[PDB]
Design a binder for these strands. Structure first.
Length: 56
DNA sequence: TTTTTTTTTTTTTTTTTTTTTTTTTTT
């Protein structure tokens, strides 16, 4: 799923800018197990979306 | 090269405090 999302962002980012189209992804929260330091909260679908997003 | 994923489950009692009020003559 993380790989699928990483391939999709690469392709979309160029096309969206060219057509002046806004894309909104809704995402859910998950817990990371075995965490002492920081927030245990994360999101689904890997790390690519965090990078490519202009607003979160 | 290429990329994360997702919570689990309650445990166990502690200690006493303080007195109120008279009643009735017998030859």
């Amino acid at each position: 799923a993380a790989r699928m999302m990483s391939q999709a962002m690469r392709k979309l980012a160029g096309n969206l800018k060219q057509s002046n189209t806004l894309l909104i992804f809704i995402n859910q929260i998950r817990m990371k197990i075995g965490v002492m330091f920081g927030n245990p909260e994360t999101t689904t679908g890997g790390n690519a979306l965090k990078f490519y997003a202009s607003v979160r």
